């Protein structure tokens, strides 16, 4: 942060790139990072936690004129956020179990299922066949790094699924480098793709 | 059923027959259903396999040294819901999530008995029946099997 | 909760000493002079690199390798031919097919990874009821053909009658964990 | 109890040798085949019998999370002795 | 705007399938069969359309049975005969039904195990 | 007296409680060729006489974000001729009509 | 412990602040290995009775979803409704409220 | 109950109360609005009202809706209509999701919209690449994610789990050309579906 | 006896917070510094 | 070299892992969710791991919960390290890189 | 059968769209095998052409009409730009796979295909 | 056959033929695509190298897991060859250089290498043994080669009787010895071509077609001893077989012809090469002794194959010699050559 957030270069190559505004975002649907990086106080740690981030304090950073320089600086410092949560997940871990207390979701332990049998059955099940969720359907969409991933899965009573779907993060971002690559020339257009978080796994799927 | 054993006891273990080539007891797993003397009295005609003794020492078969070797000897198999007499030749061959099942017909005796052939990678490791009504009921012979 | 990151302009009518720290920072470009001395704090540091062959990094007890068949203290392959290893092997890479041992037993003919197959995702090595299969701490193991990544059973009970020392230590660290 | 075939192969754990007549031992030629020479035929049956006091008796591994789950024999037949599947550790009444 | 067509609605070519899984490939729909091991009639209850089977052969190096017809392991679960054919007329391929089996309703007493007159009064309680 | 928003290609468009009295009262006049009875000119005439309202008796725009939530006024300026302009496709559209057209053929009981 | 504090000096001015406390490369302060054995805690439900599966059947407290207005099912002044109350300011992070 | 993840009765009230509203004011194309136990709704609609019901949940005072998630397409080949066509959507201003899907044949296509979210430029090309479903009023329909000469439309259930064609290297032409599937392992479909309904009164009466 | 791996009391503060500590001669020490060092250069 | 049009044929990577789901448990699927991100991998199985636990109106226990949220933070700096850095390596500073992934 | 058509109307609107693609091929074959070495000739490449709209004739129904050109403009889009490569475009000729014998009596001396 | 010779596969590349071959010059020109011929279609196929492992990479595909295997080798030994041909039911020759080395000469190349083989391939008990001369070589030849490659087809049929032989006219394909050849005569001044080219007549052959012919001829129940002549149509003239090269390959052209006094010397002068000479004595004389006319032998057509014409496949193999300015040029473009019947 140092070597980086006071340069000329650094300062004169990122400032000004991407300067995708606020509600275009959302017709483009980023969700993750570049909207926040934009003004849009957004995140689903305060608007929708899933796991423990209700009992979590932390600060979201938000940044305005989003331009490839103020979104690094956003992604920058929720590294230290996040460092401020470590301090407060190392501190307070109840000493409690592990996995889920119901053997016919979560398999028993692996001696548990050597004195006893159900425990070997269920065992026998999980590993082979699995536990016949219900039929039904979700959309998890957790703020990983890049933003909002999401899983829509579709259930049916078999211990398979029926087509899971995933939002990739990055493949609304991507289709964002259209318009933010106007103006800007071939080389600021390969710093674009750095500031979208892209790893073309997630999209390519 | 439940997920957790309360028992924390001992077991009790039963001791092992002979029936024949084709019929594999181990006991140990019997529940006491009868589910195999109401087969080998009221469809094969045998009277054979009873139960001797009460309590957890009950244990289902003959008393002595017999040899339950008859036509229709091998749906005791695919009628006890255990495991503890099952096919001897079909021992360890399978696993039936492994299997893929085609649903084809008896040859070699007349009445056109249906069947499902169960197929591993290519080659035959079970032939189960189907239930049809007018054939057979619901059960096949030993040599189709 | 949230926080600006880049929001500071307010023109304070910036005096003639606030205009310098502006003006030699600039004819001078000393905020990168911050960054050359930030590298020359590291030239003089201990570069953390190790000799590999003969320094080879840290692992863990539970890393997972080169899959082996374990075996009993009283030789008697461990294995049972249950294929509830195959049954959840996601990717597809595991084939037992199995008879009686002509003892009476119960015992494999065959057994089969495609290491090119083969994730090493682990849930071969706890779904094992008897701890037969394991993946070892193996990671230099690689191969010059396609064909020594086909570990049938052969290449993969030697394998266990290899690592036995140092895989039952790992095991023996761990069984209270899983 | 790795034995060579009249060809020149070893035997495995399984009677799998390659016949003479057969193409598919060019693989072997400027290499070899990997076959264990410790039959688990063999050193199970080089194991003693532990002729035990009680009729019902308890198998592991030596360890009981450590393997063999816990499975229980009859040991009725004093002709042959009980064994347990995954093992194949033999027993005996002693009485 | 509407528009009239009477014609039997193949969709033979929008899907690929060049041409040796159209005409030279069967189809079979039925609800599949009970494993008889266990009594449980769920896995009935749709109308899968298996296909036949065809080459397995044993790859030379390994022992694994390989193929080439891809078109194999092709499960395809509904709900009721009617939906089954509207499907495989319409991608070119050739149906074989096989209608249900329901079993008979029975009349089972516990009481006639105990008969006086009667050949059913069994033994073993 | 707004310096800098936080968002970004959102102009201040400064004399608020104009604008949003412009277009508000322009929805009211866009609407009453509407049915009476649709549920759309029903409902939204609810909002907007409330938003209306919470402007023409506010003056202080810091506490007027606290009546009509959607703080950052000037974002609401955005959807209150957002609104406005649907109301238009919906008067070219006619969604008030009958139960719908081509219902469906057995197609949502899910578990297959 | 490779410094000979003269360039602990350097290499603490250079860069601005003192790295001697803040190093990345670990020498004893780290956990060791082998640790001794644990011994993990039972869950809960482990305690013999009052644990009937019926009771905690959360895979089965499902039930399937409440259709409105099914155009041939069910067919079911008035004010206005929103999906949720809005959400709004939220805070404005004490403590570090402008880096 | 410890294990069991607390219903929250009350964000179940806000969203039903919220489907007869979209529903009363919007009775065409509207069908069996719908909310799960997971507190999450379901607004299905017949394919000539997408537009109209997607400009409304983004430009409304109370449906703020203005950022897309996903658009799936999923295959049920036991209907007419087999593929159901998904929307999911959010609202920053009330922290509250949505569902609203469609229907389709393999050839009955429906309006894009692009115009309203231009998120689903891709989203529908994909939909387009995995499936076949056409999408009237579309800048540059075509591939995202198959090959370029790619025969079919794989996410379809009637296309197999490895297709019908694999690339290899041809040093007689010096290129890599397609020759028809062939296995060495033939994927081996195992049979994991038990009897026995584990959720009864949840299930199909005859 | 159970230990499953909790931590003890407190583990003290982190310091996350930024720290990038100003110096140098600050902007009248410089120019007097080069231009001093450019009149030399000049006698 | 100023860019007036760009149209990215994403694609190159496709696999089909929304296909391959359908015929895998979903024990047997949790580590497809690792490679749609292969940065933050844990981030993708606590996603996973959620869709999964609504459907069967399941929670954790808290141990897991904060463990969960531990590690869904560590990836947080597993990333921004694999972004910070690999979007300079396209501008030319090399070496935070380096000094990042000894940390 | 009352059903909605797409992007036309009976057959008869339907094959000048047909034509105009037929009219897109026939100027373009001479220009990709300029652009990207390819060994075909010209006529080789535009028999091709009609080959692969030679057998789709059988079709009667004006949306899969209206369908097939489409994907057809698709895969000119795609060759009037280089997106395809030579190996790509010269994928349409099967020239590796042997064609099977469409005879009975040969096609079983190798294979149970029937 | 056996069990596993029998062929039970569809098409090729995971399939079985029952054609485990050997074939021994597979690290040239002619046998990399016949290994790829039987590789994929499935067939093991035994790949005896003598050479470098890095110049045998390009034949570790056109191989399905397990059907290609390699071994070591010299044929100044014993033992070496009684492991390749011995778990065999093929074998086909391809070896001969083009010229002498300092330790095998035309004599020890294409005469004592099929006699040891084929000999020791006779012991093994393998049935077929195709094996490649070259055609005009019947005896008396104005060559060195061509004198041996005859002698080569008779101390084969008297060791191995029954074998296939192939005598194939001049081949052409990419990365070959003869279009290429003709084409670096552009790096002089001009082409010395002898008599203007004229009194040779010349119908080359595709390697595909070759390699297609002899995989073909290793399944027939046909051909448990009829020679071949893998010739091809298009029975060409070299002066206007070469005009086609350098219309082809845009360069230029202009004759500079020579008798065989000097024109058989240069080669002598370039046959001073410790590499891959660029012509010897005898790479000067085949171009000149090529001439025939078919007469009565089987060919291609009644094996299988329906050969190619140079007309067709001529950018592959010279679309590299050309100039930016020519390198598209359409053979549409191109005045095909004149072709003699006679
Ligand atoms: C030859 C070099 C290879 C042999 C190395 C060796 O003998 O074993 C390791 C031996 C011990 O080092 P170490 O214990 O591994 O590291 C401790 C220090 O951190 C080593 O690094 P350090 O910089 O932290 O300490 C070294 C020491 C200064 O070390 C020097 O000798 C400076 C070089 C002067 C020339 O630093 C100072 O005290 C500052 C003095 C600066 C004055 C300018 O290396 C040395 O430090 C000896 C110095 C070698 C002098 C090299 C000059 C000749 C260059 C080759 C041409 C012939
Ligand atoms: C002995 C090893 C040499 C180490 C020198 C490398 C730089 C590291 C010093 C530490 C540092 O980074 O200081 C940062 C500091 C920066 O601190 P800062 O960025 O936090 O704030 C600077 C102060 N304000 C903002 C008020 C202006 O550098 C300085 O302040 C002063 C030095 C800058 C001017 C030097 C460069 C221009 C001079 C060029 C003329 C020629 C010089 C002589 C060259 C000799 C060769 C010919
Ligand atoms: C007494 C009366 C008479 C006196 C008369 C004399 C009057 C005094 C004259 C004073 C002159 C002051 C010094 C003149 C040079 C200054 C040049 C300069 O101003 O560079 C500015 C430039 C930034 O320009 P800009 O586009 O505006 O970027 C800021 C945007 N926010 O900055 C840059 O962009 C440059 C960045 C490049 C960094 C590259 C790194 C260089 C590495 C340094 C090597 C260190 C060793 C030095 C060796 C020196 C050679 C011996
Ligand atoms: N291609 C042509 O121009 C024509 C060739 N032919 C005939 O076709 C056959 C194929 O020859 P071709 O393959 O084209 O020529 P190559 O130059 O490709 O040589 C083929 C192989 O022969 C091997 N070889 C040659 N001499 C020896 C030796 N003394 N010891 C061991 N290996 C040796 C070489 O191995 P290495 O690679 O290690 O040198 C080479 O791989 C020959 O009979 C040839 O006469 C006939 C007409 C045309
Ligand atoms: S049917 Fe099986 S379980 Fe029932 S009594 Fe007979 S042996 Fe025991
Ligand atoms: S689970 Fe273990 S014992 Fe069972 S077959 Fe697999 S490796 Fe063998
Ligand atoms: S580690 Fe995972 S992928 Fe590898 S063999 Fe075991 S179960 Fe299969
Ligand atoms: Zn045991």
Redesign the interface.
């Given at each position: 942060e140092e070597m980086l957030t006071n340069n000329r270069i650094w300062r004169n190559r990122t400032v000004d790139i991407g300067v995708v505004t606020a509600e275009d975002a959302l017709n483009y649907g980023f969700s993750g990072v570049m909207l926040r990086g934009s003004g849009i106080q957004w995140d689903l740690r305060k608007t929708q936690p899933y796991d423990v981030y209700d009992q979590v304090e932390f600060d979201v950073p938000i940044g305005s004129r989003g331009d490839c320089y103020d979104r690094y600086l956003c992604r920058v410092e929720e590294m230290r956020q996040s460092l401020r949560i470590i301090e407060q997940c190392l501190n307070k871990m109840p000493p409690g179990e592990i996995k889920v207390d119901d053997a016919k979701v979560s398999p028993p332990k692996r001696a548990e299922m050597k004195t006893s049998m159900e425990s070997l059955i269920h065992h026998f099940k999980l590993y082979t066949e699995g536990y016949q969720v219900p039929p039904g359907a979700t959309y998890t969409a957790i703020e990983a790094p890049k933003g909002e991933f999401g899983v829509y899965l579709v259930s049916d009573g078999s211990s398979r699924p029926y087509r899971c779907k995933i939002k990739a993060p990055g493949f609304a971002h991507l289709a964002g480098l259209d318009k933010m690559s106007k103006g800007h020339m071939l080389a600021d257009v390969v710093a674009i793709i750095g500031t979208q978080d892209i790893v073309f796994g997630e999209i390519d799927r | 059923g439940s997920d957790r054993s309360r028992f924390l006891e001992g077991k009790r273990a039963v001791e092992d027959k002979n029936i024949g080539p084709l019929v594999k007891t181990i006991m140990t797993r019997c529940i006491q259903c009868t589910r195999c003397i109401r087969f080998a009295s009221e469809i094969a005609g045998v009277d054979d396999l009873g139960t001797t003794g009460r309590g957890n020492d009950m244990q289902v078969g003959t008393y002595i040294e017999k040899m339950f070797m008859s036509e229709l000897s091998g749906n005791v198999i695919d009628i006890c819901p255990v495991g503890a007499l099952t096919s001897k030749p079909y021992a360890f061959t399978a696993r039936p999530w492994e299997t893929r099942k085609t649903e084809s017909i008896d040859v070699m005796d007349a009445v056109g008995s249906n069947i499902v052939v169960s197929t591993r990678t290519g080659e035959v490791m079970r032939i189960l029946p189907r239930m049809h009504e007018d054939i057979n009921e619901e059960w096949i012979s030993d040599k189709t099997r | 909760t949230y926080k600006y990151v880049n929001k500071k302009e307010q023109e304070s009518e910036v005096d003639m000493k606030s205009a310098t720290d502006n003006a030699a920072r600039i004819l001078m470009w000393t905020e990168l002079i911050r960054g050359l001395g930030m590298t020359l704090s590291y030239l003089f540091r201990e570069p953390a690199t190790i000799n590999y062959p003969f320094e080879k990094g840290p692992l863990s007890p539970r890393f997972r390798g080169e899959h082996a068949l374990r075996r009993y203290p009283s030789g008697e392959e461990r294995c049972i031919a249950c294929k509830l290893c195959e049954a959840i092997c996601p990717a597809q890479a595991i084939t037992i097919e199995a008879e009686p041992r002509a003892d009476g037993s119960r015992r494999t003919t065959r057994y089969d990874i495609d290491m090119t197959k083969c994730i090493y995702c682990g849930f071969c090595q706890e779904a094992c009821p008897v701890d037969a299969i394991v993946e070892g701490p193996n990671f230099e193991f690689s191969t010059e053909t396609h064909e020594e990544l086909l570990y049938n059973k052969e290449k993969l009970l030697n394998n266990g009658d290899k690592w036995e020392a140092e895989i039952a230590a790992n095991i023996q660290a761990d069984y209270l964990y899983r | 109890g790795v034995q060579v075939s009249p060809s020149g192969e070893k035997i495995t754990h399984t009677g799998q040798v390659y016949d003479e007549k057969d193409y598919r031992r060019v693989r072997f030629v400027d290499r070899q085949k990997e076959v264990n020479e410790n039959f688990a035929i063999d050193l199970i049956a080089q194991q003693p019998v532990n002729e035990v006091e009680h009729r019902i008796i308890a198998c592991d591994g030596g360890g009981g999370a450590l393997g063999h789950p816990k499975v229980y024999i009859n040991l009725d037949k004093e002709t042959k002795t009980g064994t347990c599947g995954y093992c194949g550790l033999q027993f005996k009444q002693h009485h | 705007q509407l528009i009239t067509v009477d014609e039997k609605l193949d969709i033979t070519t929008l899907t690929g399938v060049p041409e040796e899984h159209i005409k030279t490939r069967k189809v079979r729909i039925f609800v599949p069969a009970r494993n008889n091991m266990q009594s449980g009639v769920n896995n009935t209850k749709k109308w899968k359309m298996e296909f036949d089977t065809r080459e397995r052969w044993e790859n030379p190096l390994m022992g694994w049975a390989s193929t080439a017809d891809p078109l194999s392991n092709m499960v395809l679960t509904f709900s009721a005969k009617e939906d089954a054919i509207a499907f495989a007329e319409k991608n070119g391929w050739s149906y074989d039904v096989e209608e249900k089996k329901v079993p008979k309703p029975k009349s089972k007493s516990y009481g006639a195990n105990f008969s006086w007159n009667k050949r059913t009064r069994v033994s073993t309680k | 007296l707004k310096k800098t928003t936080g968002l970004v290609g959102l102009a201040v468009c400064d004399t608020p409680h104009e604008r949003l009295t412009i277009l508000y009262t322009k929805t009211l006049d866009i609407l009453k060729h509407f049915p009476k009875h649709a549920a759309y000119r029903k409902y939204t005439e609810q909002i907007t006489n409330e938003k209306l309202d919470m402007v023409k008796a506010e003056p202080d725009v810091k506490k007027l974000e606290a009546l009509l939530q959607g703080g950052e006024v000037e974002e609401v300026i955005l959807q209150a001729e957002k609104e406005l302009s649907l109301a238009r496709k919906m008067l070219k559209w006619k969604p008030w009509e009958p139960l719908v057209e081509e219902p469906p053929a057995n197609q949502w009981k899910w578990p297959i | 412990a490779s410094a000979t504090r003269v360039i602990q000096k350097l290499r603490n001015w250079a860069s601005g602040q003192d790295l001697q406390a803040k190093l990345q490369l670990r020498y004893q302060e780290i956990a060791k290995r082998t640790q001794p054995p644990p011994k993990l805690p039972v869950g809960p439900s482990h305690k013999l009775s009052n644990n009937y599966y019926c009771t905690r059947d959360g895979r089965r407290e499902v039930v399937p979803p409440s259709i409105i207005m099914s155009s041939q099912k069910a067919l079911v002044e008035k004010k206005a409704v929103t999906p949720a109350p809005p959400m709004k300011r939220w805070e404005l992070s004490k403590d570090q409220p402008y880096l | 109950r410890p294990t069991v993840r607390p219903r929250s009765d009350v964000t179940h009230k806000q969203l039903s109360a919220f489907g007869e509203y979209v529903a009363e004011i919007l009775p065409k194309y509207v069908q069996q609005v719908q909310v799960s136990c997971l507190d999450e709704l379901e607004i299905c609609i017949h394919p000539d009202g997408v537009i109209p019901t997607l400009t409304f949940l983004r430009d409304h005072t109370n449906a703020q809706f203005k950022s897309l998630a996903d658009l799936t397409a999923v295959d049920v080949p036991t209907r007419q209509n087999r593929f159901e066509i998904v929307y999911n959507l959010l609202s920053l201003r009330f922290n509250s999701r949505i569902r609203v899907k469609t229907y389709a044949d393999e050839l009955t296509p429906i309006d894009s919209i692009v115009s309203v979210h231009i998120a689903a430029n891709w989203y529908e090309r994909e939909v387009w690449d995995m499936f076949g479903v056409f999408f009237f009023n579309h800048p540059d329909l075509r591939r995202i994610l198959t090959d370029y000469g790619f025969e079919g439309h794989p996410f379809r259930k009637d296309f197999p789990l490895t297709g019908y064609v694999e690339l290899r290297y041809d040093d007689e032409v010096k290129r890599v050309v397609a020759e028809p599937v062939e296995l060495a392992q033939e994927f081996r479909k195992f049979d994991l579906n038990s009897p026995w309904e584990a959720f009864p009164a949840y299930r199909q009466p005859p | 006896v159970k230990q499953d791996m909790p931590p003890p009391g407190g583990y003290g503060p982190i310091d996350y917070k930024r720290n990038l500590p100003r110096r140098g001669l600050s902007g009248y020490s410089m120019f007097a510094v080069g231009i001093g060092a450019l009149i030399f250069g000049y006698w | 070299e100023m860019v007036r049009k760009c149209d990215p044929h994403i694609g190159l990577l496709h696999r089909g892992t929304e296909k391959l789901i359908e015929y895998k448990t979903y024990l047997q699927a949790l580590p497809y969710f690792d490679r749609l991100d292969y940065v933050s991998m844990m981030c993708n199985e606590q996603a996973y791991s959620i869709a999964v636990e609504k459907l069967l109106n399941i929670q954790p226990p808290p141990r897991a919960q904060w463990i969960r949220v531990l590690f869904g933070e560590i990836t947080r700096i597993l990333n921004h390290i694999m972004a910070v850095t690999t979007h300079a390596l396209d501008i030319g500073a090399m070496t935070p890189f380096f000094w990042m992934f000894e940390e | 059968?009352?059903?909605?058509?797409?992007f036309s109307?009976?057959l008869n609107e339907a094959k000048r769209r047909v034509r105009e693609l037929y009219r897109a091929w026939y100027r373009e074959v001479?220009n990709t095998?300029?652009?990207m070495?390819?060994?075909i000739?010209?006529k080789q490449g535009r028999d091709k052409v009609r080959e692969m709209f030679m057998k789709?004739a059988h079709?009667?129904?004006?949306?899969?009409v209206d369908?097939?050109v489409?994907k057809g403009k698709?895969?000119l889009?795609?060759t009037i730009k280089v997106?395809?490569?030579?190996?790509?475009?010269?994928?349409?000729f099967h020239?590796?796979?042997?064609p099977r014998p469409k005879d009975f009596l040969s096609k079983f001396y190798?294979?149970?295909?029937? | 056959l056996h069990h596993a010779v029998i062929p039970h596969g569809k098409g090729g590349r995971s399939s079985v033929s029952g054609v485990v071959a050997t074939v021994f010059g597979a690290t040239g020109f002619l046998g990399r695509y016949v290994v790829n011929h039987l590789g994929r279609m499935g067939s093991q196929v035994i790949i005896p190298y003598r050479c470098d492992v890095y110049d045998i990479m390009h034949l570790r595909l056109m191989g399905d897991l397990g059907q290609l295997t390699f071994l070591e080798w010299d044929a100044r030994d014993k033992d070496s060859i009684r492991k390749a041909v011995q778990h065999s039911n093929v074998v086909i020759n391809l070896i001969g250089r083009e010229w002498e080395t300092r330790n095998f000469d035309f004599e020890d190349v294409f005469v004592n290498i099929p006699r040891a083989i084929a000999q020791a391939s006779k012991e093994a008990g393998v049935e077929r043994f195709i094996h490649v001369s070259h055609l005009n070589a019947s005896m008396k030849s104005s060559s060195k080669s061509l004198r041996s490659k005859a002698v080569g087809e008779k101390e084969v049929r008297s060791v191995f009787p029954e074998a296939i032989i192939i005598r194939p006219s001049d081949i052409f394909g990419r990365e070959d010895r003869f279009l290429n050849h003709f084409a670096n005569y552009r790096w002089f001044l001009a082409v010395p071509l002898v008599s203007l080219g004229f009194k040779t007549v010349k119908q080359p052959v595709y390697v595909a077609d070759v390699s297609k012919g002899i995989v073909n001829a290793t399944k027939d129940p046909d051909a448990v001893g009829k020679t071949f002549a893998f010739t091809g149509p298009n029975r060409y003239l070299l002066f206007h077989l070469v005009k086609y090269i350098f219309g082809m390959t845009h360069r230029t052209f202009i004759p500079y012809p020579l008798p065989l006094f000097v024109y058989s010397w240069i080669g002598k002068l370039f046959g001073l090469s410790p590499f891959e000479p660029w012509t010897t004595k005898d790479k000067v004389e085949r171009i000149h002794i090529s001439d025939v006319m078919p007469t009565d032998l089987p060919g291609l057509e009644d094996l299988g194959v329906q050969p190619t014409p140079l007309e067709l496949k001529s950018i592959e193999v010279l679309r590299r010699h050309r100039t930016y300015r020519w390198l598209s040029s359409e053979i549409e473009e191109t005045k095909p050559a004149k072709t003699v019947n006679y």
């Open positions: - | - | - | - | - | - | - | - | - | - | 059968t009352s059903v909605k058509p797409i109307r009976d001479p095998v300029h652009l070495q390819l060994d000739t010209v789709n079709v009667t129904d004006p949306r899969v369908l097939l489409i698709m895969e889009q795609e997106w395809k490569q030579r190996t790509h475009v010269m994928r349409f020239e590796t796979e042997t190798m294979g149970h295909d029937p | -």
